[PDB]
Design a protein around this ligand. Structure first.
Ligand SMILES: *[C@@H]1O[C@H](CO)[C@@H](O[C@@H]2O[C@H](CO)[C@@H](O[C@@H]3O[C@H](CO)[C@@H](O)[C@H](O[C@H]4O[C@H](CO)[C@@H](O)[C@H](O)[C@@H]4O)[C@@H]3O)[C@H](O)[C@H]2NC(C)=O)[C@H](O)[C@H]1NC(C)=O
Ligand SMILES: *[C@@H]1O[C@H](CO)[C@@H](O[C@@H]2O[C@H](CO)[C@@H](O[C@@H]3O[C@H](CO)[C@@H](O)[C@H](O[C@H]4O[C@H](CO)[C@@H](O)[C@H](O)[C@@H]4O)[C@@H]3O)[C@H](O)[C@H]2NC(C)=O)[C@H](O)[C@H]1NC(C)=O
Ligand SMILES: *[C@@H]1O[C@H](CO)[C@@H](O[C@@H]2O[C@H](CO)[C@@H](O)[C@H](O)[C@H]2NC(C)=O)[C@H](O)[C@H]1NC(C)=O
Ligand SMILES: *[C@@H]1O[C@H](CO)[C@@H](O[C@@H]2O[C@H](CO)[C@@H](O)[C@H](O)[C@H]2NC(C)=O)[C@H](O)[C@H]1NC(C)=O
Ligand SMILES: *[C@@H]1O[C@H](CO)[C@@H](O)[C@H](O)[C@H]1NC(C)=O
Lengths: 190, 272, 42
């Protein structure tokens, strides 16, 4: 045996008779064993230790945005505090989603409206999108996507609120929906 | 003591200097060694013909730790081949910070002077976080946290879950787990590859960060009609194996589905 | 001897581990050609 194996070496003699006279036969055989084995038990063990559970909680809020766009195709964001338009000029907007798990949710739009102010609860409201769908009584409104992915967009002609109202804002309301659990796309018709 | 001392900016007191003849007979009072020679004076009997002296001196035993006060020591003298043949009286007082003081007395005869080994100027105490007192144990400076930071039960264990939109994380006070009986902790999610790490925002914190998706580190999302909550279990053990007090902090936080969104630009048209 | 036995308190790996499996690798030696007695001290 050397440092690794251990050989058992012996020689075998074969003949057809008691006495040998030609072609002596020697079966020189040796089989070795390595010195290092690998062993493991065949039983799984399941101990038990007491577990103290401190169940703690929290709440989170996702990040989601809304940018004015200088151009059609919804490519670049407005950065000025105020934008001047003609009434005939078309408005071009869209909403971003950076909250998290963008694979699972679909940015879906319950309702958006226009008020002369930043007060979201201003009673004077023009629902620019009404119940997940564009108004049909207004035809200048058109949508490209809502709830199709994490980003919805749409365009419409500018207006002004009748009266002493020279300003218009956009308060929109978004609802997350699972893209596999339920179908999110609202397909409305008159 | 710590405020009434005279500094000695002399680089020739080091144990590496070749040879000399200066003996200190006029030295009286508290002294604070400053410079390249060292901040502490010798702990072992430095061999003959060093410290700019034929027979150099040393202090026997160990330097005092923080919060020890006046300590009586007998500074020996090495000469002729017998360490500690002559003796002088020295009183060491530890000080809050990285220096020491001594009443450096006149040795019984000339050809005797103290030494300054390089000591532990490399060992700094700024590495201790702000709430870690600059305490010492037998001459080495350690970051002992507040003794008022002493909680016995683990139900009082501190944890800050900030439910960030893009990612989830729970941060734990390192001092409080230290005093809870944990030297090194092993914090683990439902998957141990989400191993813990250290971060400092206002104090020493140990934290894990996990993406808020369904699956990647075993967090579970159960979106009911209103909320979309993500729950993962936290595992604490101060070593590889737990033998008692198995710890399971069940942390979670929900994300809504509805939310309000508006631009940040005003809008005004012009019309005939 | 030709038998290697030993004891230890049961334990448990921290994390999501509900099982412990044991896996040993043995080394055979000559009782006469070398000293197989292992002695370790701190
Ligand atoms: C310690 O001693 C052991 C026991 O002898 C020794 O292992 C042996 O090594 C030799 C040298 O490699 C092997 O000799 C054989 O020689 C011929 C070719 O030279 C072939 O028969 C063998 O190769 C075969 O390997 C596989 C075996 O099935 C097959 O792929 C195929 O048959 C190949 O032909 C082999 O080289 C001898 O077989 C081994 N014995 C073992 C491994 O059990 C070891 O090398 C020594 N260690 C030292 C000296 O450091
Ligand atoms: C959908 O799943 C969500 C996610 O869990 C679930 O919301 C949960 O509602 C319950 C019931 O209100 C909350 O249970 C908590 O329990 C204790 C007291 O019982 C407290 O922690 C909470 O009350 C706190 O409420 C305010 C929170 O700041 C504070 O006034 C104060 O801290 C109160 O202690 C609360 O009642 C549980 O926390 C929420 N989960 C959250 C918020 O993540 C919801 O009910 C489910 N909807 C269904 C099934 O329709
Ligand atoms: C937003 O507009 C409303 C209506 O002008 C403001 O006044 C509130 O109106 C509601 C009914 O719509 C009353 O019940 C409340 O008492 C009113 N006050 C408050 C403080 O809610 C409201 O104040 C405005 N909010 C903002 C943030 O501008
Ligand atoms: C050394 O510290 C001592 C203790 O505070 C200071 O006073 C000495 O006290 C001892 C013990 O009572 C006396 O035997 C010494 O005579 C005192 N020394 C002196 C110089 O009065 C002492 O001042 C410190 N030594 C120095 C040089 O400051
Ligand atoms: C000083 O301490 C050293 C080493 O610890 C020891 O050998 C020596 O006896 C001590 N001297 C006195 C005077 O006690």
């Amino acid at each position: 045996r050397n440092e690794t194996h251990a050989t058992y070496s012996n020689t075998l003699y074969l003949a057809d008779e008691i006495i040998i006279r030609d072609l002596n036969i020697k079966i020189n055989f040796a089989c070795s064993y390595p010195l290092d084995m690998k062993v493991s038990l065949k039983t799984a063990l399941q101990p038990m230790v007491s577990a103290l559970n401190i169940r703690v909680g929290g709440t989170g809020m996702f990040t989601v945005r809304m940018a004015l766009f200088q151009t059609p195709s919804y490519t670049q964001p407005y950065q000025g505090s105020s934008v001047t338009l003609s009434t005939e000029a078309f408005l071009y907007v869209g909403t971003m989603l950076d909250g998290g798990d963008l694979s699972r949710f679909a940015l879906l739009m319950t309702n958006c409206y226009a008020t002369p102010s930043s007060n979201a609860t201003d009673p004077l409201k023009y629902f620019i999108i009404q119940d997940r769908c564009p108004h049909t009584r207004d035809s200048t409104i058109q949508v490209v996507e809502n709830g199709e992915s994490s980003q919805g967009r749409f365009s419409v002609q500018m207006f002004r609120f009748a009266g002493n109202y020279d300003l218009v804002y956009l308060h929109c309301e978004v609802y997350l929906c699972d893209t596999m659990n339920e179908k999110c796309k609202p397909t409305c018709s008159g | 003591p710590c405020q009434a001392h005279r500094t000695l900016d002399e680089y020739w007191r080091s144990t590496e200097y070749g040879e000399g003849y200066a003996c200190d007979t006029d030295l009286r009072g508290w002294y604070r060694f400053v410079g390249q020679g060292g901040a502490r004076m010798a702990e072992t009997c430095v061999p003959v013909l060093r410290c700019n002296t034929a027979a150099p001196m040393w202090l026997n035993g160990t330097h005092p730790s923080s919060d020890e006060g006046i300590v009586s020591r007998k500074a020996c003298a090495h000469w002729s081949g017998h360490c500690c043949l002559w003796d002088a009286s020295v009183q060491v007082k530890a000080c809050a910070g990285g220096y020491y003081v001594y009443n450096l007395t006149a040795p019984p005869e000339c050809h005797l002077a103290y030494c300054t080994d390089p000591s532990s100027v490399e060992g700094t105490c700024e590495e201790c976080s702000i709430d870690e007192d600059c305490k010492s144990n037998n001459g080495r400076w350690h970051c002992q946290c507040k003794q008022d930071f002493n909680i016995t039960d683990i139900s009082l264990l501190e944890h800050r879950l900030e439910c960030g939109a893009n990612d989830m994380k729970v941060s734990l006070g390192k001092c409080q787990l230290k005093s809870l009986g944990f030297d090194k902790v092993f914090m683990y999610l439902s998957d141990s590859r989400c191993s813990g790490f250290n971060d400092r925002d206002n104090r020493d914190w140990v934290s894990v960060v996990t993406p808020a998706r369904d699956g990647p580190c075993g967090t579970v999302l159960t979106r009911n009609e209103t909320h979309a909550t993500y729950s993962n279990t936290l595992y604490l053990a101060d070593e590889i194996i737990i033998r008692d007090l198995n710890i399971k902090i069940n942390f979670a936080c929900s994300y809504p589905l509805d939310m309000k969104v508006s631009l940040k630009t005003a809008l005004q048209p012009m019309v005939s």
